[model samples]
Target: MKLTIHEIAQVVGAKNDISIFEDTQLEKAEFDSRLIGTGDLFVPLKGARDGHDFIETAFENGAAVTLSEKEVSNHPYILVDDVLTAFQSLASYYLEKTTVDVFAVTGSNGKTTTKDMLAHLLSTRYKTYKTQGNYNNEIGLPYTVLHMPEGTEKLVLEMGQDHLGDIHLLSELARPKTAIVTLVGEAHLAFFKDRSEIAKGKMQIADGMASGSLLLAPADPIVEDYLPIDKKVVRFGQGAELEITDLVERKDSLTFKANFLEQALDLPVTGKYNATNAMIASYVALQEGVSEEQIRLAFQHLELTRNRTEWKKAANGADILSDVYNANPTAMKLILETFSAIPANEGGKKIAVLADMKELGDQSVQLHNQMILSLSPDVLDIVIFYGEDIAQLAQLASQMFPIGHVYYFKKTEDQDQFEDLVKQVKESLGAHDQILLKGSNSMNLAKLVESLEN
Candidate 1:
């Protein structure tokens, strides 16, 4: 963020007079007091705790100037109506000053994976930066923009939405040159009526883009009604423009070929859903003039975000497929199907550990129970479920499978019960057994995976 205090004041419509230190330069902007440094501007945000209480701490930590909603006497500050709005305005202005071409991605799933893949591919030919961590929301997007390097050529942003018009606000603020919408699913169903409503919310990425910009979307009919006709839309999937002609799913990787490419492409990630993510990213990279060889090289050594359908090894040498960061009916079903289909390691058993998929609203119990269709005794040796909503599914599983093959725990808080659950699973494990952990982040299934590894 290269800006003078005066320029920031002008951009954010600061209310106070700025005759003193008009040429003071700000090297960066930060909301957290701990990250503030010399020449860094402090942005006070209101969340669970008021940021105004930390103004002295921010200044003590070397903040040069602060953007505050209220008047401050001890430190030089830019008085604004709202600090968050001002911070966002400063970020918007900084992006306009830079020469980077923005490539934004949003959807119910695969946003982070696709962003990482695109960044990796583009970095082979250009200096690229992407959204780091869970910084895909309104506040995080601005922070990402202000923190980009001096000469970044490609800026890849992951746009996430929890409610309607969230993506619209982010889209207008970033105004990306190329946008990609991965498949829409049942994520955030508590805030939406159905999948179509979620699709409508995700489509707002086009609201900020220019008319001639490109949009890469899936061929699913659910997205048909919400797509932006103004942009150049490229669909990927069966019978689409960029079709996957052939695909081979491996334990830790996937090999597939698309219609636009001559040679087969291999990604070091499992599942067909990841293949779709790679295809969309490949299309974006190709449009930006990144070579096919570069894309191929990037995929072979991709660095994805943590805990999104990654494979790990348990201490007992059992294969673990973990996707515990998040879960919805669609994502859970896809991963379960993919994991079950993978060849069990040399005469070993297939075990599944599932928990509640949160935020399903009134249909949470029904959605949880519907997972029974994917659980078959023939395909799975044992099925373990956690969470209160999963009790219905556990009962259904007990009826479908024998008594010893099914288990459920109403709450993961019981130390003895959870320990016993882990012990039973450990006892059931073989050297070649394949286990899958799938659930929402709140369920702490990832912790269980860690316990098994320990």
Candidate 2:
């Protein structure tokens, strides 16, 4: 956000400009006024309280300019009819101002995995920065567009949609050279009426893109009804043109070869779900002129570290296979597929504590129900499903497994359930019992993870 208020006012179509704006332009934008610094702009957004409600506090909190409905007395402000809409225009302006060709990543959990994968693949060839720590939202993506690191040529944005209009807005704003809908997911706070509606929103990933863009979407049939017909399309999985021809889960590492590549590629660590992320990332990397050997090297150096995707110990001395950073139907399916197939400890059992994956779609509950398709009754000894919709989630899980093996707990603003589940989880674990957890970052599973580990 190096652009001064003078120029930003021009881009956002400021109705009335402040005098202070003429010399101001050295900070980033924020939705929360409390988080604003002397160099920041307060872009109060829509929600339970109008963004307008926070402008006074924003100015008081060292804001450089507040995107506001009215001009301030002596303070800096950029007047606009709608703050968020104009803020979006400001983001597009900054992004358009770059030689940086963007790669927009969206769709449930794989999108998160895909962004990190795509970022690693691209950084070897181009200076890159990926965004959307939940940036797929209004504030996050727009803030990302303006916060480009110096000389960045590749921006891997992990976009998420809280509304049907979210993806299209971001798509048109960033106007990516390539748009990837990793896979359509269900359950976005009930906003999406059906999977097709969900597909429709995701298809908009390329809707704002140029006529000749590239799209690597999943090969699901639901997408046909909402295809990105304007761009170059490549579909993957099941029967798509590009797919994984082989997957090798060796005793020590993981590997997979795509229909587009000849030899099976090596991934030093992780599983098949990640194999999917790595596969598409490699394909996209190849399109960007990253040679196959670089793809191999990128992943060879891609071993995961602690405080991230790997094994660690719970405070109770139980081994934890943590996949808690992200989650979705396919992500859950593949993790369960790998977890259930592995050998359990000789005396201790294999436990899976699944928290909810929310904010991506409305079918979240049904998607939770769909998870029963992947879990194994004979392998994972204890499975706990936790959340609001998760009570019904355990209903099916219990029906499928032995009565004592499946446990379900509901979570609200209340605190009792959280400690209860942790108490139950901690007591059941011995040094040999291995617990596997996977869910979206938005949910409090991260806190559960933090609670379980020392």
Candidate 3:
């Protein structure tokens, strides 16, 4: 982080005493007392319990300075109105000092996968820094900034939001040199009145970007009305400035083709969505001055994102899609649409195991109820749902599908029934059958996926 304690206190608006605290260089910043390291600064935040309670622990763990709302006896404390806001200030300062071209990404879905893809692809050409894990929110974003090694040239950070203006705050912190908006769909459609409102929020990613910076989005016309003029907007995906036209998926991996440098070039990865992801990544690499051949070679070593439309074999011989990485109406519908579009294996039945998609707020029930359009009655042989809210969806599916074909495991503790679910799946499976486990990340369906792999 390389900030002097006095400099940090000035930026955070903290009252400091010169005699009591010497001019010490803050080596790092931490919020969790459990994670405090030697010579680090701690920012105590108020959650269920005030973080002030953890000041002693931070000091015990060798925190040299603590940002606090109240004084701690004989400890170095930076008093501030709000520690979280102060942490944001520190991150903004760190970002301002950094000489990296930060690439910020946000959307209802595919942001993480796209961010990972961008990071991996950029690494083929530059010294890249990026958000690690799900560290895309306020605290995590700043922590990401403070953690970057001094000499990174490109940084890829994912920004996620739930309500209005949340993206604005994250954008203010990241201040990206380039940004990508994957898509706007039924992800938070439950809370929002319409798709336009969702587009408004996702477009905020360009707020902190420099004027005329590259803004990449889906070719879909939905967000064009809300697009910001501060940046040069480039549309990618189907029928966009950059497009993927051909794809062939094999048992182990995928291959696809895209348009670039005035010719069609083949790349690895399956699904139109992934082809789009790779296309944007390649375009981004090319924009950053990596040659066409470099991007082609990068694709050869590309790692397909885990849990996004992945097909793995089950112990009982059924195929499974472990897309439980996350769930929303848009993602589920897209996955289902992709599944339905594929030519079915001869003599095979398709089954679905769905769980609740959370954080839709006011739109939860309607969003759950709206997924009926994604699944075809004739194609989906068995549809089982877990979690309380999705029962509404299960009822809708029951009315759409034939009787005895739809099942709802209504018990929440039914996490215990994973073995039973596996048994039912085994009973329903033939060598060529396909069973899909689709749901929000909270649904521990991976346990079921593990049993299948066994």
Candidate 4:
């Protein structure tokens, strides 16, 4: 960041006399003392162990300055009543100092994919930076802002929330020039009262934007009540302002066309949901002066984050589609639809291991049972349901599917049959079968995917 030590203290309203410290431009700000480097600013936050205890350790690690609640005897310190608030203030000020255009993205799912796609597309015409993996929360968002490369022209930030008012804080911090809400699904449904509550949190992405700034949102009714009136909102999905006219999904890639584009576009990844994400990215890029040709070219080389509905191979040569990183009802249903529609490998059966979707709270069992409608016996030969709440769904599946075609693995705090689940899943697999695994990250299905791949 371009802010000097004195300027940072002034911006954050630090209480100490920091004029003695040379007006050196701080390189990066870090909360972890272990990551402190030469000339970096150390922010002491209260956690399991008091961050104040690590102030000396930070100085030992080459930290040039520290934001402290108490005075220090020898080292350079900026005394502040609260360290985190000061850190956030500095980050907000840096954005104004740099004047880089910010494009904020938030949703229940697909926000990360959209952020990556938009950053890749914007890089074609301008210097762009994006939020690193999983850095979409309060501290992460400001950290992303302050850490942008010098002279960055476009900044793509992903905002994630677990409760109400989470996105509002991040939005006010970044104050994006353009915002995108990819989809409002059942993610963190437990923290919310209902789907509308979650939609209200996701819609807060527009809280800090200017009156006429553009917001691309999904056309779901769940978000209708929370839509912002002050911004220029364009909704996507069926019969919306921007719609996907057609999509042809292959095993590893997809060909799609949007209503606004004259020609077709190809993405290196699969999933109809990802096509929606790419289209949002394309629309934003087009608005920013990037050509349709540029978007098509950029998407041809799309590199999605790992374990996000990518194709992998098992040790026995089975094709494994791993969407194991995250799972909500909407995301799980969409992937199941895409996977079920695709043609299986030659002389191979289709097997799916659907694990429990977490954080559903009062609606956990109902949501798990609701997934039965998405599963069909005609397409899938072997279906496995893992987790406690899914036991009922597994029993229901056994009645619908043929005998011995379905299996249930228990996963609760008291009982963990992961090893047995892995063995049974491996034994049930065929060398030519196409396997799919979808579940919440808490279940460690990624390890099962690892077991299959290795």
Candidate 5:
């Protein structure tokens, strides 16, 4: 972070004498005492076990200065009212002095995928740093900002929010030069009253940016109502400047085309949604003077996202596209429509491994029950449901489909039951089946996929 003790203390507005920590410069900052290195600043936070308890360990592990509420012996320490707030101040100061052009992305879905794509594309020409994992929240965001290499030319920060103003706080801190908004869906609708409030929350991503900075968003009508009129906004998707023209879905995968810089260009992967993300990434790269061919070449190696419409072979020799990394009513419906609409394998069944989506309020059960519209009996020969909320979905499917065609794996105390579920799915297999395994990561289905493949 390269923040001198004097600069940090002055910015944090410390009441306790800053003399002990004033001369030291923190080369890095970390919360884990185990990660402490020479010149690293450790800021202890009160968690399940108070960070104050680890003060001695941080010093022993080579922390240059420890920010803690209580004083400790023989080590440089900055006494603060709250270490977390002080850490945020330190991160803010560090970002302000840096010359990197920051690009921040936030939304209900696809934040990580878009960030990864942008980083991969930008890395071809610029040294890019981005949010490492799902660490796009307040705590994680600061850590990302402070850890950027000294000579980085592009920095992409992914911001995640579960409630109103969460993105606002992150935006103010990052103040990105360019921002991207993916889409707002039922990812967290249980908290907000409706989509408008959610849209209001997502719009806060541009709050920290300067007036002339650009905002890239979807052409979804709802997003336009809440967009920042003061900034230069580029909308991609349905009907906007730089939109995907024609999206084509094939048997196992899909290919689409887009027109941004004069001529139409073919793009890998299906789903207008993903194409939209790629388009924004391409636009940003072009703005930075990267040739069109460089962006095109990067898309071919687009492993930036691990599993969005990725192809895999099942034990029965069928192709499986494991895009089920996440599930919500709207997202599931979109994928279902996309899958069912695609030409099914010449002689195979279409299957789905459905799991309970969390955080759907009182109507959660009804939401599960309503998925029937998207997956009709004719479209999907087999459907598997897990968790208590989806039991009713299994019931509905059983009535709609013939016996032995639908099944439910409810919450079970026995680990054997999970193994049994895997066996049952394998039993229903056909050699050419196309399975769409969609659910939250907690479903442990990835383990099932591993066992099946082995």
Candidate 6:
């Protein structure tokens, strides 16, 4: 960051003595004291535990200044009403001072992938940076803005929403020059009314975009009611303005062509969903004057965020496909269909270990029960269900298939049951079997995958 302490205090309305150190430069800002370093500003935020307790730690870590809600005795402090708001105001000020072109992306499933892909493609021709890790929330967005490297030509940010007005808050804060909405799905349905309401919230990505700025979105009818009129809207999907044509789905990759590209694009990741992500990313890159050759070369070495449709190998010589971070109906259905279609290894069977889909609200059971439609005895030889809600799907699967083909763990928290389930999986697997792990992160299925790997 290029802001000095004096400038930040002024921007955040901090009532601190300016003469003590008016020109103290702040190189960066961090909420966690562990990451604080020389010339860095410490922002104390209140979460489960009070961050104010870490003020001394922050100072010990060589923080130049700290944003505090209360007075600090020995450390240089900027007293503000709320540390988070003050940090956000500082980030907004710093963002306006830079000449970087902001590209904000949001959606239900593919926001992170699209953000990474866009950054990769833009990096081919420009000094680009993107939202790092899971920092797409209100707190993370501002941090992402302030952390952009000096002389950055392009900034790609990921916008995530958990409730109403969340995306609006981020959009207005960043005020992106261009924005992309990947797709609308039932991600946080616990707080939303339906997919249409989620679509309405996702449309807020355009809330910060200016007139004539480009807004790319999916061609799905869910987003049709939430389209924006103030900006140029370009839709991507089947029969859209920027259509994906001549698609081919491989076991480990996908090849497709879009209207803007001169040649067909091949992505190292599987599924048509990733192709859609790449398509939207390529469109954004094309708008920024990135060439087709640059796009092709970038995808040749694509780097996706961990735990999203990654293929791994077990110590027992079995194939493991892990997508265990977050699960919604649309995302789970897409991945299950894609995985089931892939031919299993020679003399091996196809196995799937699924857990509960969290945050579905009143529709949780119905959504969990609906997953049975995707499970077929012909394609899947064994199906293991975990979590409380997954019991419904397991019972249905048992009725459809043989007795031992379907199994369920009523309580995923039971230590003995989890161990037994792991042992069962280990004993049943062959040298060439393929197993899939898809569920909410809280289910601890990733731990099971790790155990099997050991």
Highest lDDT: give the candidate number: 4
**Candidate 6 or 5, higher lDDT:** 6
User: Can you tell me which runs of candidate 5 are displaced by over 4 Å?
Assistant: 108-112, 250-254, 262-270, 307-454
Q: Which regions of candidate 3 fall more than 4 Å away from where they truly are?
A: 108-112, 187-190, 261-268, 304-445, 449-454
Q: Which scores better on lDDT, 2 or 6?
A: 6
Model 5, range 97-167, lDDT digits (tens) per residue? 88678889874233227788788789899988988766687888898888888788899899986668999
List TM-score per model, in order.
0.71, 0.67, 0.69, 0.70, 0.67, 0.71
Instruction: Give model 5's clash tally.
Output: 0
Clashes of each: 0, 10, 1, 0, 0, 0
Task: Give per-residue CA lDDT, model 2, range 238-321, as digits (tens).
Answer: 678888888889876887888888777887665766788788888888999899888888888774532445467777667688
Candidate 4 positional error at 220, Å: 0.9
| Prediction 1 TM-score vs. true | 0.71
What's the lDDT for candidate 2? 0.75
lDDT agreement of model 3 with the native: 0.74
lDDT of 4: 0.83
lDDT of 1: 0.81
Which candidate, 4 or 5, would have the higher lDDT against the true structure? 4
User: Comparing 3 and 6 by lDDT, which wins?
Assistant: 6
Cα lDDT, all candidates: 0.81, 0.75, 0.74, 0.83, 0.74, 0.81
Model 3 per-residue lDDT tens digits across residues 140-200? 7888888887788898888876566778899988788899888657521333556777778
Which ranges of candidate 1 are over 4 A from the true structure? Answer: 108-112, 308-454
1-454, model 1: which lDDT tens digit per residue? 6788888998989898666654598878888776789888998886424578778888898888899988888678899999988988888888898957999888524323788888888999999998876578888899999999888999999898767889999999999999999855752144456788778888889999999799988898998888897899998999999888999988877899988987789877776877888888898999889889888888888875665445668887778877754356756775676677665678768899888877865667887887888888988999988788888999999999976898887674543356666777778778788888888875356568877788
